[PDB]
Amino acid sequence: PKRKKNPMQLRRKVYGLHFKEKYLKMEEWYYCPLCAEPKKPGEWCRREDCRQIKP
Amino acid sequence: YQRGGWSPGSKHQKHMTLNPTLYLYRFPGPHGPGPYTMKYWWTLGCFPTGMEVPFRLHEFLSTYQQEHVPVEVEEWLRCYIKDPLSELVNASNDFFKAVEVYPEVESARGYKTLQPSIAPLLVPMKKFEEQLGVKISPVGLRSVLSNPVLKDRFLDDLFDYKSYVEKGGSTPHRRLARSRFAETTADDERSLILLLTTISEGCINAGNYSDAASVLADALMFCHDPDSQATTHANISFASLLNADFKGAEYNGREAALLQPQVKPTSTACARGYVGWAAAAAYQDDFEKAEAIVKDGLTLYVGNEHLEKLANKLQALRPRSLRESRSHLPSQQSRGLLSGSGKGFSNEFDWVEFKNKLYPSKMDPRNNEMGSVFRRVGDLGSFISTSRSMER
Amino acid sequence: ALFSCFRCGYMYEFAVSNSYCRKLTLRNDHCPRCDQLTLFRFMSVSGMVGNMPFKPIGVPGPSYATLWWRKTREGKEASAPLDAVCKSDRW
Amino acid sequence: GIATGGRVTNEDRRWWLVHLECAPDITPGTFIAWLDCCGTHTCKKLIERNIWTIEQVAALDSDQVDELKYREGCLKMDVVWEHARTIITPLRQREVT
Amino acid sequence: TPVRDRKCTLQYYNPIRARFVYRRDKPLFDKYHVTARNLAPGFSRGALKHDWRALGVYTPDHPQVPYHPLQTWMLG
Amino acid sequence: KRIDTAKRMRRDRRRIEELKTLEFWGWYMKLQRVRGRWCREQGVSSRGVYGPAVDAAELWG
Amino acid sequence: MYARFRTRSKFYFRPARPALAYNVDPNVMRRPKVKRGLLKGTYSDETVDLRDRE
Amino acid sequence: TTEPLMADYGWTRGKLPKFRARSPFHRQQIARRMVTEMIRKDYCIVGGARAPALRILADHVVELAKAGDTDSRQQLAYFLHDPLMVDKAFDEYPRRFKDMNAKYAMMTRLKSRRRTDAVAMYFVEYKNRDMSDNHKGEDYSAGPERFFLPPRIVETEKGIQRPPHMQMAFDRWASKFKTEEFHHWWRLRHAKLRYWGVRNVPHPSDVDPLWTEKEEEEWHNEMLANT
Amino acid sequence: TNRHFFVARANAFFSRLPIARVQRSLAMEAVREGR
Amino acid sequence: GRFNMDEAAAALQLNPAYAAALYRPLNYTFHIRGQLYPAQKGRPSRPGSLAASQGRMFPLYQRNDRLDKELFRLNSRGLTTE
Amino acid sequence: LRKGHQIVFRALEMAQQGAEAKGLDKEHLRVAHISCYPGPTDKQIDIRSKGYYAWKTKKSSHLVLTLAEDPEMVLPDRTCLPYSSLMSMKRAGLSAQPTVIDVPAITADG
Amino acid sequence: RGDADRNFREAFHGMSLDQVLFRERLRQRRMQKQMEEKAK
RNA sequence: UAUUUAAUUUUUAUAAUUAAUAAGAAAGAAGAAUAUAAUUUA
RNA sequence: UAAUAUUUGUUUAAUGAAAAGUAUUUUAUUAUUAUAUUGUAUAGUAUUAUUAUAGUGUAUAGUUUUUUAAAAAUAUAAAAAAUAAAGUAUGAAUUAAUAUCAAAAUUUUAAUAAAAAUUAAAAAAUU
Ligand SMILES: [Zn+2]
Ligand SMILES: [Zn+2]
């Protein structure tokens, strides 16, 4: 760095899509019909119902 | 050299031959000293640098000085404890006075009105509850004070309880006294079970099922009448069905059934017990037994509108390894939102519980998978434990 | 790897994998000559177990000691007595 | 031949008949392992059925074949079977002279 | 404002859930193997709100399943 | 004294390490005799999904 | 990309509060005894301090 | 490299994925202890690019087990830290897998990740266990009590018996955790990790033992309850 | 270049033509004219 | 029919307290400098807790001078020229 | 996977217990206000070559969380299951549509 | 234990444990009412 | 690190009317990973 | 500067150790053959540093804390091979007169001229 960056340069990084995708992003989920925990589709739990039929 | 302050907190680069400082490992900062040095304060006894002189006077005055009380005093203190009869009278009185002045909820149109908070009501009730010995829902209380009908029941049942406790003795205190050194439920206790059932009934309308089930436990604690016992056990059957406590429902479902000979012909209770027992059996996926139970209900009780409903609903519905796997009702979804394993925390990979202490997943006393400490244990210089050549 | 016990020096050979690296210098095994568990030493290197792709399998080349041991055993003079029975390529 | 999908076409047969003369010394009594698509597993299960011979694999009734490829599980069995079916007659002919 | 919660996107198109439609899951399932699990017949790439079945989409050599109207609970 | 001690310590651990070993080999052979016993009644050939004829050929063995 | 975060300018600049001369808060004799958090709009039910032992 | 054990760890599709390590030698060592552990205990909770590797390698081990050949026995014997588990591998897997040709190991991605790092957790199993001799009815939903106890058995399957030569080995291995020098190792481990300092590791005077005699006399009780 | 014509690939459909059959067919045509 | 170091020492006439001292480091038996971990050192009693000493939490790692005087340092009566 | 979210989860849970102890409704709660403001600090020595040192700053923060009740809320259905889960549960024999059972309203006649 | 129970429940005419015990205790209580009405 | 260039912002059904010398629901592995879009599989 | 560098604990032959001049052993401990008295465990170099210095004396105690799912270029070894870069967590340092910035060209002005004037044509983020 050759100079102190003002609040605008600090604020410029949040307009970027990289920032938004990394930090402020909401996850999509449903309720596991076997466990009733919030769940992302494609990720399962160690429980013998959830291994064979993985809901 | 020295692009920052000459303090031993200051930001930038320093040098040893110019700004000599000794080795301060975690030096508590300029303001507040934070949770890290305090972690050290509560575990090893002082701050990690050993320059900060441990000074705990301010908590010695808080814990040890306060509990000092000498024997000559504390041998006399329990001779002065308040009269519980009088305390029940006073608690009932001011609790009722505080509930009576709760404003009627104004009904708006097009939007729901925010109910007035029960702030002033927590203070009388918390005295009343543990003068009585039963914990009461705040939520159920507010929901009862919403409905005019429920408020009516609650109010006049409180009034009856008041009057019976003033004119008569306190029956649970009677049968507590006669226990350590049998009779039908007394007037005041009838009032009490009635108002507790009212408040649990209100507790259900707001959708707190666990709490409504927990309130009625003390409600059966206070009932010695088999009619009262039947009704209360039934009620707990249903309140534990909504809570998805299925062993609780399929416990309390059948006592309400067992009371059928000595309960009056004018009761709906035992049939409700049948319904709960059956429903609990149904929710655990055993349908055959469910239909068997409803068959028994319609055998003994002939036609019964709930057992009509449940016979035809079961009929409409018409492997052991997969049973009670399914999540059928929302309250266990709610209970699954809390107390669940999420990504990164509250799973089996973060901290594991062992004898009420926390561990890293590396020392996991129930697990030897890879990375676990117990894989590194060796044979401890006695006998070869495993035939493994290289590792262990 | 060539192995001989300390007491009777009974000679035999088996390949040693990368899993057994800690057993390479000293073995414990049952001798046919003195029958009981003995202690074996590693005199000579013979061969790998695995080989990398596009590379000859046969060159971690086993030493002259091992090839001498497979000359003395299994040789023209060694087989000639036994060829009257089997001639080992034949049954 | 080897990499054909599904049904075996007649053109494919032509391939096998061409490679019959590609190898000078062949007799119908030759070991199974000279066949297209006979692996280790495919040879072994034929052996416990007392089949060593190209003639013997050409002697199969096709319901021995399918339970070889389904109930047991030697895959690509109909390929080798059919490979026998084609080649056994020419071999006899070349054996005579 | 009304709350910022999103309604169900579980039935919409998703480009990372799109790849698993034609992918081979034989090892993932022990007892329960299904013909094609992620593949919804007649719907664009496994998404239930994208229903094409019994419309005019001309596909001479591939099958199409007929239309039955989807329930309320399957979508959201 | 410490020369003698340094060999006194390194001789007897060498002694008892064999006591570990011989009992361990004794035990492993007991174990394999248990396999020898048990695999008879269960009919385990431990030779794969192939019957006795397959190995009987000995071409594949 | 669905949430909205704009960087707060207070983290960029945090000057310390002005210290008192001889501990004399110049307006004690003028203003009320009301807690400044109350008139500011700051209120809390539970204060949970993680520097506590429990 | 087409040979169904020897591993090719690249990123190109012909190669099974290389999981991060120090050297390909180190990769081989890691893979070996993973396979050994999986053969010993049917499931592995394994993070990263390691799990697909375990899947493929387990399929290779079952293929070798189906081979049932002395060369196969020997080549599997080169590969494992356990000789005994090789015997287990040729006793169990053929009867277990006689009806299946392909994909013998089930991989299941877990929705939980290491706290330590972002790497995902996979649950790798052998497939059908109702044909297995020693793994017949076991429940893996949760772990056992103290990790030297035999794991949970399903309520409907309680009365199952296991090959004697296996529970002999298991009891011999578990019997060194009941001696008090293990307890000293346990406390001393607390001291060590606390020194290297690692949070949430209690002081060695709070560390009350994994094994007591009351717990043993109830555990053996319920163990003969399963027998 | 990220367009659809370029990124999308036809690998999955390759069973629709018999590659192995045509190679051997032109082997036949190789020995028929005698190359 | 396990190893049982005590019965192994009894079979070898090795003085079973000694035989065990072969398999722990010389720090834990004999008076010799060695790496010690401060968590082993012991702790005074807190208000919540009791005292913690290395007598109770580590009996088997403490030094024995039977072995130390009989192994390492000299006897005086062997040298007495008087 | 973030630390901040874990901390906020602890805060949410405790404030929820607080709000239930205050007598509000669980199903209608909403985060009305979430904010962070700078808290206390500890410091540390980072040792650097040629006799250079610097002070690492271990930062800490204060979190403010206000849960307010909003009776007009409606929550998006989260009970949707993907088609894959649907036909898997159908294949196993499970019902993809959960069991509702008519439950008589609790009433006390005694 | 699976077939153990499959023997148990089919000795009881397709009842379960809890239905058996429930029937039983129900009878014991109705006969307690019987003892009551015969004594009073 | 600032400018400057080069690449990228994760399948755009499609490309060029001119400048200068181009963009549809989303992230774990792009692979269920041992080059088949399932090699039959309990 | 800084959503930065660093750190990152999945498998041990560090056998040994007087020369360390710091570390609540609650009673660390003989049974002696000897007498009284005295004293036995981790801090060298600002560090739990690269890793000690030296004198003992001995050879099978494996004597048991190193993250990670593509490719450039850097570092080793044989442009292939081995290693490392989106990552969750920790979190420094050089630098800082600046306004949301300063892109291209031309001449001028007291010495590059990011100084002028004129024409002009520099979006955002990341590498
Ligand atoms: Zn689940
Ligand atoms: Zn010998």
Side-chain angles (χ1 to χ4, degrees), chain B residues 343-344 347 350 355 358-359 365-366 368-370 375 377-378 383-384 386-389 391-392, chain H residues 33 36-37 40-41 81-84 111 113 115 144-147 172-173 175-176 190 200 208:
Chain B
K343 292 201 301 181
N347 46 12
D350 183 2
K355 290 185 169 70
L358 286 184
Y359 283 97
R366 51 190 194 280
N368 52 7
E369 281 293 325
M370 301 177 64
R375 191 159 290 271
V377 72
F383 59 85
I384 303 93
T386 337
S387 52
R388 320 193 64 157
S389 176
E391 297 169 346
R392 281 191 297 168
Chain H
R33 65 189 177 200
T36 305
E37 186 193 14
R40 179 184 190 181
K41 187 182 191 177
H81 300 292
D82 246 333
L84 180 60
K111 71 175 180 180
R113 302 188 178 194
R115 179 105 163 104
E145 295 78 10
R146 291 307 182 266
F147 89 75
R172 185 168 204 272
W173 171 75
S175 64
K176 76 164 174 90
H190 280 274
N200 286 319
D208 52 353

Side-chain angles (χ1 to χ4, degrees), chain B residues 42-45 64 381-383, chain J residues 2-3 5 23 43 46-47:
Chain B
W42 296 114
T43 58
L44 80 93
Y64 273 180
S382 294
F383 59 85
Chain J
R2 306 179 188 288
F3 181 71
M5 176 78 65
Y23 282 99
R43 189 180 64 188
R46 339 272 291 275

Side-chain angles (χ1 to χ4, degrees), chain D residues 1 4 9 11-12 15, chain I residues 20-21 24-25 27-28:
Chain D
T4 184
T9 175
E11 140 189 10
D12 187 17
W15 182 260
Chain I
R21 189 170 302 312
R24 291 173 305 177
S25 296
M28 258 78 158

Side-chain angles (χ1 to χ4, degrees), chain F:
Chain F
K1 192 173 177 182
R2 73 178 65 180
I3 286 169
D4 190 17
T5 298
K7 275 180 284 62
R8 190 199 158 191
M9 291 183 59
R10 295 186 185 263
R11 280 183 70 262
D12 46 5
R13 72 177 63 174
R14 281 306 305 269
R15 283 189 190 174
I16 65 184
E17 75 180 14
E18 287 122 10
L19 287 178
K20 293 179 185 175
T21 311
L22 272 66
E23 82 87 12
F24 187 55
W25 279 74
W27 178 72
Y28 192 88
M29 284 298 105
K30 284 179 186 177
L31 199 61
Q32 297 310 111
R33 281 190 297 104
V34 176
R35 271 186 70 251
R37 187 178 181 181
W38 180 79
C39 289
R40 288 193 194 100
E41 302 86 10
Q42 293 295 319
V44 174
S45 61
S46 171
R47 285 201 67 81
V49 292
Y50 309 104
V54 175
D55 67 42
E58 282 183 356
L59 158 75
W60 289 108

Side-chain angles (χ1 to χ4, degrees), chain A residues 15-28:
Chain A
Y15 306 125
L17 189 56
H18 305 84
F19 194 88
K20 297 180 178 179
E21 287 303 312
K22 185 181 304 180
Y23 289 146
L24 37 114
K25 188 180 70 288
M26 292 186 186
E27 305 292 335
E28 300 171 352

